[PDB]
């Protein structure tokens, strides 16, 4: 299927408690494969998936230098944004950035990303054209003018169309045992009486990869979107994910309810029912 590579970065200032903490992680699809934490005893880019361990020492040197430089520029930018927003030096603030690429089954670029947030709000984003910027406010417009004057977008476009896709394709081949394997959900319905009048039907999806999935309840063939309790997809800790959807059902009417499951590891969507 389709694939993605993403690098995530977070810097959090902490006035009076040293310099901002910097954490960055890299993902292919939903698999974490590299990390760097400035608060580690000896900060270095570290592998987190077996298929990246084979990369040589020069790779880990390069990635570590880039992460360290990113931590330093983030520190400078945190001071800059205090000025842009007329903020006191006394508070903690957050700078986030994500960038990366999406490719289709043939490995062609589907789209690229590079976007930033300040204190959890969108700040500046490279548009899908990979050539223009969307600034959220007048402070981000100051960055936009700087980045336009330096033609930053053209440097990002070159990376996202070139190295990002080329190295994603290499990682997909080196990790093809895992990165190119979808694990379908294991599904079942449980029944939990609430009262003499109602019971919860809970539709489970377990052990699936990647995280994207659709679980829905129907009653007499009609979607129950408004009456379904849907928990956020959650990691099991073994690479796979879990999710459930629940509906409250009048006692005796359980067979009018069907759970429907869509996942890229399933050839055709599943339909299941409570089985007493």
């Amino acid at each position: 299927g389709s694939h993605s590579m993403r690098y995530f970065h977070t810097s959090v200032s902490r006035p009076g408690r040293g310099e901002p903490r910097f954490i960055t992680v890299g993902y292919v699809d939903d698999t974490l494969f590299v990390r760097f934490d400035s608060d580690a005893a000896s900060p270095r880019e570290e592998p987190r998936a077996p298929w990246i361990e084979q990369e040589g020492p020069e790779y880990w040197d390069r990635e570590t230098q880039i992460c360290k430089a990113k931590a330093q520029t983030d520190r400078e930018d945190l001071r800059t944004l205090l000025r842009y927003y007329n903020q006191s030096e006394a508070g903690s603030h957050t700078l986030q950035n994500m960038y990366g690429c999406d490719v289709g089954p043939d490995g062609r670029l589907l789209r690229g990303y590079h976007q930033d947030a300040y204190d959890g709000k969108d700040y500046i984003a490279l548009n899908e054209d990979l050539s223009s910027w969307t600034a959220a406010d007048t402070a981000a417009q100051i960055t936009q003018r700087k980045w336009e004057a330096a033609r930053v977008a053209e440097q990002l476009r070159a990376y996202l169309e070139g190295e990002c896709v080329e190295w994603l394709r290499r990682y997909l081949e080196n990790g093809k045992e895992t990165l190119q394997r979808a694990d379908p959900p294991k599904t079942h319905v449980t029944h939990h009486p609430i009262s003499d009048h109602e019971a919860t039907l809970r539709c489970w999806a377990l052990g699936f990869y990647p995280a994207e999935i659709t679980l829905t309840w129907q009653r007499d063939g009609e979607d129950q979107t408004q009456d379904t309790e849907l928990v956020e997809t959650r990691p099991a800790g073994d690479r796979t994910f879990q999710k459930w959807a629940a509906v409250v059902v009048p006692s005796g009417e359980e067979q009018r309810y069907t759970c429907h499951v869509q996942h890229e590891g399933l050839p055709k969507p599943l339909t299941l029912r409570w089985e007493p």
Partner: protein
């Protein structure tokens, strides 16, 4: 500032079978800012060598973390996750329910 209070889910890696070793998970998500305090409890007592994932975030910029530890469920032992965040007037304790 703007703040988002964490969603909290407490659950096991594998379906619970009493007497069989497993992993106890506390997944915190959708929160901002990123500073957060998470404890896993056994019968009210903090479990010691709990590990956690590296901070990452979702499309909407909110953060998520997984805290986890080996555990062997039984019928009588109670497990919970205790979470403190700037959005909480007091720590939130979410009990483990093997059916959720």
């Amino acid at each position: 500032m703007i703040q988002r209070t964490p969603k909290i889910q407490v659950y096991s890696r594998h379906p619970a079978e009493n007497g069989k070793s497993n992993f106890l998970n506390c997944y915190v998500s959708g929160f901002h800012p990123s500073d957060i305090e998470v404890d896993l409890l056994k019968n009210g007592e903090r479990i010691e060598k709990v590990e956690h994932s590296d901070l990452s975030f979702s499309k909407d910029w909110s953060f998520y973390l997984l805290y986890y530890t080996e555990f062997t469920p039984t019928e009588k032992d109670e497990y919970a996750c205790r979470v403190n965040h700037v959005t909480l007037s007091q720590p939130k304790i979410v009990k483990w329910d093997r059916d959720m």
